[PDB]
């Protein structure tokens, strides 16, 4: 009779995990490389996967934190004496202007907030709460996108959470300076429903639920085969 | 390198009790007796495990319900009882010694119960 | 411990002259409430595995020639042969299965006289 507090939704659900880690550049190069963009979603780590899709539907809030690190750049004309380096976050609300490259207009939108953070200080943090217009998200969804039963399958456009685009707001005359960032996500008051039995085969894709057929269990020597056996000794005599 | 004895071999006849008796000159804690069946049509096989100190004994099923095992610790001879006795069980009956609870280290010295009906 | 003492030397006749042979116990072999005498006369081809003649000292092993009759109630025990064969050489023990431990006997050769 000793206790469960360690098996709540709360204490199982609610351990910060690292979910994306991406780089980019703050010089001269193909735009692309010079900003970090990140869709919002449980779907592409499949060790917290497996952990969210033993529920049908569930509600929380996100906390959401980045780990930035910079380094200087091998090359020529190397930067002899730089003052710090300071960095734009970005959230975009679903529906919101997406940037396309940086430098853009929609980086200075007012719909979008941002956090401007200098080198030293602790990491970034903001909170999102629960952003949707259903009642809740929902991990697996039988249906399709329009009632004409046609489109994309297992889609539900209720779950959508944003994105995070990360750039440098400084810029750099004297060499390049590329920067690493990773992203801690976490979930909290968490409300879950609709138990399902854990996955058995491996995962294929983010986006669908497909599968290969694998077998139920692990094969064993003999319906009475008990796990191995021990030898005579001063017990056994 | 401890010599070993036994009772010895001695002509016997069809449903007659023989008792093929074991010296010892160890002691008898967590040690083990036993024989084997010494025949060259028929290989080797073992008949009964004794256990000084232990107070277990067992049999093949090929002799349970047939043999019996007995013995005397104080008196340092070992009996291995049989009953309903034929005329092809005829071994050179080895005494196997173990001062371990795994091994097989000392061998007896043999015996014949060869029998004519 | 509980042991038995065979008689003081081998054999040692001819070829075809009956043989009695006595095995003295030091303690006494029999359980008076079932009167069975627990000593057996064994015999040990060299090289081979042993094998004895008579068990309880009054049934002869099923197989066994007529030739061996083993006799003796309490704590002695003999043994007899109408015809001793120069191919029957082997070591003759009186072992004993009373109580533990199994000891064997002494010793008897089958030694050369012709």
């Known amino acids: 009779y000793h206790s469960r507090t360690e098996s709540s939704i709360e204490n199982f659900l609610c351990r910060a995990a690292c979910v994306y880690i991406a780089t980019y550049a703050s010089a001269g190069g193909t735009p692309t490389e010079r900003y970090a963009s990140w869709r919002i979603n449980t779907r592409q780590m499949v060790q917290l996967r497996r952990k969210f899709e033993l529920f049908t539907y569930l509600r929380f809030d996100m906390e959401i934190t980045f780990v930035i690190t910079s380094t200087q750049d091998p090359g020529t004309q190397l930067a002899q004496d730089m003052p710090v380096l300071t960095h734009q976050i970005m959230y975009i609300p679903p529906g919101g202007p997406v940037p396309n490259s940086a430098t853009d207009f929609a980086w200075q939108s007012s719909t979008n907030p941002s956090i401007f953070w200098t080198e030293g200080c602790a990491p970034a943090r903001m909170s999102v709460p629960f952003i949707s217009i259903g009642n809740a998200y929902s991990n697996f969804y039988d249906g399709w996108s329009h009632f004409t039963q046609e489109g994309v399958y297992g889609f539900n456009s209720l779950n959508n959470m944003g994105h995070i685009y990360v750039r440098h707001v400084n810029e750099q005359s004297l060499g390049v300076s590329t920067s690493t960032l990773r992203v801690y996500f976490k979930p909290k008051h968490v409300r879950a429903w609709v138990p399902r039995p854990p996955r058995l085969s491996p995962y294929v894709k983010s986006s669908n639920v497909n599968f290969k057929p694998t077998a139920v269990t692990t094969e064993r020597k003999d319906i009475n085969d008990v796990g191995t056996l021990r030898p005579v000794g001063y017990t056994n005599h | 390198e401890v010599q070993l004895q036994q009772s010895g071999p001695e002509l016997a006849r069809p449903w007659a009790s023989v008792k093929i008796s074991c010296q010892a000159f160890?002691?008898?804690?967590?040690?083990?007796m036993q024989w084997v069946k010494q025949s060259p049509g028929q290989g080797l096989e073992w008949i009964g495990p004794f256990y000084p100190g232990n107070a277990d004994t067992s049999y093949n099923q090929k002799f349970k319900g047939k043999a019996t095992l007995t013995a005397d610790k104080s008196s340092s001879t070992a009996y291995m009882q049989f009953s309903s006795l034929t005329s092809e069980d005829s071994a050179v009956y080895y005494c196997?010694?173990?001062?371990?609870?795994?091994?097989?280290?000392?061998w007896g010295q043999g015996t014949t119960v060869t029998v004519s009906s | 411990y509980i042991e038995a003492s065979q008689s003081p030397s081998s054999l040692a006749v001819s070829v075809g002259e009956k043989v009695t042979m006595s095995c003295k116990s030091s303690?006494?072999?029999?359980?008076?409430?079932?009167?069975?005498?627990?000593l057996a006369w064994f015999q040990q081809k060299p090289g081979q595995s042993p094998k004895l003649l008579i068990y309880?000292?009054?049934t002869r092993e099923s197989g066994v020639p007529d030739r061996f009759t083993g006799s003796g109630s309490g704590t002695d025990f003999t043994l007899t042969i109408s015809s001793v064969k120069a191919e029957d050489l082997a070591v003759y023990y009186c072992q004993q299965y009373y109580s533990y431990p199994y000891t064997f006997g002494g010793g008897t050769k089958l030694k050369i006289k012709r």
């Open positions: 309880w000292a009054s």
């Open positions: 303690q006494s072999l029999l359980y008076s409430s079932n009167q069975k005498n627990y």
């Open positions: 160890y002691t008898f804690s967590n040690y083990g």
């Open positions: 196997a010694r173990v001062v371990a609870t795994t091994d097989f280290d000392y």
